[PDB]
Amino acid sequence: MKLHERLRELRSERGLRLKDVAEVAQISVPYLSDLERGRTNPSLETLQTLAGAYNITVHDLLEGVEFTEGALPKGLSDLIADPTLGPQITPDWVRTLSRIELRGKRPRDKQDWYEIYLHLKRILS
Amino acid sequence: MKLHERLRELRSERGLRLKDVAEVAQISVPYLSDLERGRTNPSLETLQTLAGAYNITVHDLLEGVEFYGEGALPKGLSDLIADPTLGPQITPDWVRTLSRIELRGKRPRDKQDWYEIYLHLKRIL
Ligand SMILES: [Cl-]
Numbered sequence: 001m002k003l004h005e006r007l008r009e010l011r012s013e014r015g016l017r018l019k020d021v022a023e024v025a026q027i028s029v030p031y032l033s034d035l036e037r038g039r040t041n042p043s044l045e046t047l048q049t050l051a052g053a054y055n056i057t058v059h060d061l062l063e064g065v066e067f068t069e070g071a072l073p074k075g076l077s078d079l080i081a082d083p084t085l086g087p088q089i090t091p092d093w094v095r096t097l098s099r100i101e102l103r104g105k106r107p108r109d110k111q112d113w114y115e116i117y118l119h120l121k122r123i124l125s
Numbered sequence: 126m127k128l129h130e131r132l133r134e135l136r137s138e139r140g141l142r143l144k145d146v147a148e149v150a151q152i153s154v155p156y157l158s159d160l161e162r163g164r165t166n167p168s169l170e171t172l173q174t175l176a177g178a179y180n181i182t183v184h185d186l187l188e189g190v191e192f193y194g195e196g197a198l199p200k201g202l203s204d205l206i207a208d209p210t211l212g213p214q215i216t217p218d219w220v221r222t223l224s225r226i227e228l229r230g231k232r233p234r235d236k237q238d239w240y241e242i243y244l245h246l247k248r249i250l
Contacts, residue, residue: 003169014206015217015224016197024197044128044166048192055196055203059187067169068177069149071141077180080139091140098140 003065004038010054010061011036025049072098079110079117093117128190129163135179135186136161150174198224205236205243215243222246 011021018029018036025032027049034040035050042050044058051058070077076098080086097117100106107113126134136146147154151174160167167175169183176186196203202223206212223239223246226232233239 013213013217013220014198014203015219015221020197024195041169044169044192045194048194051192052195053197055198055200056207058192059184059190060207062184062187065184067173067183068175070180071145071149071178072139072180074180077139081181091138093140094138095140095142 001064001066002038003041003062003067004036006061006065007050008036009064010050010056014054021050021053024053073106073113075107075109076113079113082110085110085114089117093121096120126189126191127163128166128187128192129161131186131190132175133161135175135181139179146175146178149178199232199239201233201235202239205239208236211236211240219243219247 011018018032021027022029022032027046031040035042035046047058047061051061054061072080072094076094080089080094097113097120100116107116136143143154143157147157150157152160152171159165160171172186173183176183179186198220202220206215206220223243226242233242
């Protein structure tokens with residue numbers, strides 16, 4: 001969702017008036033209201049202020065929300081993300097693998113990437 | 126952890142060089158480095174750019190980081206409305222109703238405590 005919708009949801013579902021939030025944060029009602037409208041976008045340090053008064057972390061505040069590209073191919077990133085599998089792979093091995101492309105084509109998903117990683121490791125060792 | 130370390134972790138664990146991450150994002154190589162060492166913090170517009178460039182979301186990117194700098198509700202009262210299975214069934218104005226229960230500033234601690242009272246009182250009213 002949008003961030004202004006989320007910031008309004010957190011206070012309304014919690015039964016709080018703008019003033020209640022205003023006072024516990026170091027913030028005013030017009031500015032907070034602008035933020036819950038979404039004219040302004042807040043600093044991270046304003047988001048701390050809001051999180052802390054909602055008794056929520058800033059990670060958790062940003063749960064339902066959304067607001068580019070990608071520097072590795074997505075399957076390669078998924079492999080880096082796998083908990084059991086990923087960590088065993090050198091930072092080097094990621095950029096080495098990442099250069100593998102045939103005119104656009106790339107290994108599709110992480111066990112594709114994992115597969116050739118294993119073959120390639122034997123050869124380059 | 127801290128947001129500058131996290132931003133340095135993502136690029137380091139993917140064997141990426143600053144210009145990689147600077148080339149898919151609007152930012153400059155110098156600006157990224159100042160983000161990564163902690164000198165200034167990025168906007169939310171900037172955060173999203175980096176996150177997608179690491180193929181994760183902004184929520185996930187802040188999985189780990191934390192910030193420093195008071196609550197408008199009791200913690201357990203918040204913990205309850207944040208509970209996904211137990212929390213949406215409670216209305217904003219049951220939430221207000223609960224918060225006025227304190228004796229000497231002493232309050233129900235955990236959400237089971239807040240829930241226990243909600244069930245009794247909701248039956249009385
Ligand atoms: Cl080619």
